[PDB]
Design a protein. Structure first.
Lengths: 257, 257
């Protein structure tokens, strides 16, 4: 799905969000931090499905929420990948250098099913049993620091669930920025404001964005900016507290220098 | 901490709760089900701690909630252990028969610390970094079906956090029963009723119970019955909808026949 130059641009966005949280995030964060964050998000993903046999039987999967949780994993996976790229070779943990088969047991659904390219995520993801096996595997990828592999898995999940991964990433990226501006660190952010969850507003912010537009080498920057603005406008954020893509790219290009 | 005959009696309680959920639970449930449930609970446990570096900085650990989450893991671990005991030898998965070192990477805190007997959980559990390493290990035990090992870990955690594991188990066991009577399956249960979480009521139901009383070979049944009644009374449950220990033991003894 995603061209290399687009993925590089997403990483730059991720770098800027991470730096907003902590200027020297590479020096302060650890590979285990990102692995933990992914593990935690993966359980939020699974909680979108009616996996419990003792509660809410015959509930249908919250597939809309799944979009969000996939994008959250993606943020942490991009982060872990560049944490790895920045890790000196002699500080790379053994689990990430050993054969994958030696550090992971792979889980499979009972019923026959499509797979992603690797042997890890299963379709359709409308199916609870496919989702369970999928994200038990993701947690084991995380534990073995295979952030790049997790990234591929997410793109295929997004393909199957029939949503625009990149568009959703920019929307949530923007919300993540918004939360840091609005007291997320000090506990004053109202995440569920008047019964409504902040994530739930993001869907309407991406209805107007096409698959070709968000990945198109010429069009992507304008399209990402329009998602950004939609999200900032949805949260009543003043113009002067906003950033655009170019700005995130600029902050990354000087962070690299 | 816990004598063998007491653990056997807890298993009988667990068997009865599981049968209330599904009469033939051994035939319908799988080892992966219990492993998944433990994985999910372990993330709820970790969410009691200020592990996030981007939210609610300098929050203190919800150690009271930790008690509950530990007991939830215990319920699923007892369940997995007797699922294993009931699994024909040729259906036992390889991960549970291989050397533990071959199916698990063990996580350690950075700072020096006490351990439980096995090499898996770290003290004090007032420390976020100890908790993180502890439950990343628990999830890997779960994935390798080491339910009995998880059980030992929980007893040592309870020792360090200075609470009565068995007393808390009976209280939550009773609440689990109460939820099944009150529409948990069909979605009509009010878990957060008037802003208050049901689990949060359980603490006052165990203040009057001592460590010696709940494990004492003569006294344990009366003590467990009094916790049971306290919990049923805390949720306004009519006498005729209650069960006592003897009753759970009786239901187990005929389920075995
Ligand atoms: O250094 C970071 C830290 C967080 N994040 C982002 C990624 C992810 O999209 C987001 C997740 O934040 P939370 O887990 O705090 N909340 P979420 O959006 O999952 O809702 P919930 O509170 O229900 O978990 O945090 C970063 O990108 N970089
Ligand atoms: O077959 C089962 C299924 C559930 N259980 C119990 C064990 C555990 O104490 C309890 C957990 O139920 P939930 O996860 O539904 N709710 P919890 O108490 O963790 O609160 P929350 O909804 O916040 O997860 O279910 C059994 O004992 N046997
Ligand atoms: Ca989260
Ligand atoms: Ca999330
Ligand atoms: Ca739970
Ligand atoms: Ca729980």
């Amino acid at each position: 799905n995603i061209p290399g130059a687009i993925l590089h641009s997403l990483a730059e966005l991720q770098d800027g969000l991470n730096a907003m949280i902590d200027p020297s995030w590479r020096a302060v964060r650890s590979l285990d931090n990102w692995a933990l964050a992914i593990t935690m998000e993966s359980t939020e993903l699974l909680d979108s499905y009616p996996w419990k046999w003792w509660k809410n039987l015959n509930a249908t999967p919250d597939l809309a929420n799944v979009r969000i949780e996939l994008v959250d994993i993606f943020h942490f996976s991009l982060s872990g990948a560049m944490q790895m790229r920045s890790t000196p070779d002699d500080e790379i943990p053994a689990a990430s250098l050993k054969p994958l088969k030696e550090v992971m047991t792979t889980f499979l659904p009972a019923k026959e099913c499509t797979s992603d390219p690797y042997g890890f995520v299963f379709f359709p993801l409308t199916d609870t049993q496919n989702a369970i096996a999928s994200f038990r595997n993701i947690i084991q990828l995380a534990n073995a620091y295979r952030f790049d592999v997790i990234i591929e898995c997410i793109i295929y999940a997004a393909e199957d669930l029939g949503f625009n991964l990149v568009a959703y990433y920019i929307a949530k990226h923007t919300l993540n920025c918004i939360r840091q501006l609005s007291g997320y660190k000090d506990g004053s952010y109202v995440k569920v404001n008047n019964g409504v969850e902040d994530n739930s507003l993001l869907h309407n912010c991406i209805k107007d964005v096409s698959l070709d537009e968000v990945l198109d080498a010429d069009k992507y920057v304008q399209a990402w900016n329009s998602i950004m603005a939609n999200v900032y406008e949805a949260f009543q954020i003043k113009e002067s507290d906003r950033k655009d893509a170019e700005r995130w790219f600029a902050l990354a290009k000087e962070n690299r220098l």
